[PDB]
C-alpha cells in the first residue's frame, strides 16, 4: 500500500503514554525501596551521595 496508515498509527503514542504512567509507578516503588534501606540504616542527617 502507498496510501499510508490510518488513525491506528496514534496507538503508538498511546502505548508510549501508557508506558509513561507505568514507568512512574515502577520508579516510585523502586524509590521507596531506597528509603527503606537508607532510613533503616544509620542515616538521620542530610548529606550528599546517600
Amino acid at each position: 500500500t502507498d496510501e499510508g496508515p490510518g488513525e491506528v498509527v496514534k496507538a503508538l503514542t498511546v502505548n508510549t503514554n501508557i508506558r509513561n504512567s507505568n514507568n512512574a509507578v515502577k520508579r516510585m516503588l523502586n524509590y521507596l525501596a531506597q528509603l527503606r534501606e537508607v532510613v533503616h540504616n544509620g542515616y538521620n542527617r542530610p548529606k550528599f551521595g546517600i
Partner: protein, 37 residues
Amino acid sequence: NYNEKSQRDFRVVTIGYNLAASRQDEFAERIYPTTVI
C-alpha cells in the same frame, strides 16, 4: 421456502474503540509533573 425468516441479513453495530492516553495519567502526572526538555 415456506418460511423465509430472516437469517442472512442482520443489523450490524460497530462498537467504538477510542483507546486514549495523554502523556501521564492523573496519578503519574500529579506525582511527577511534566517538564518539557
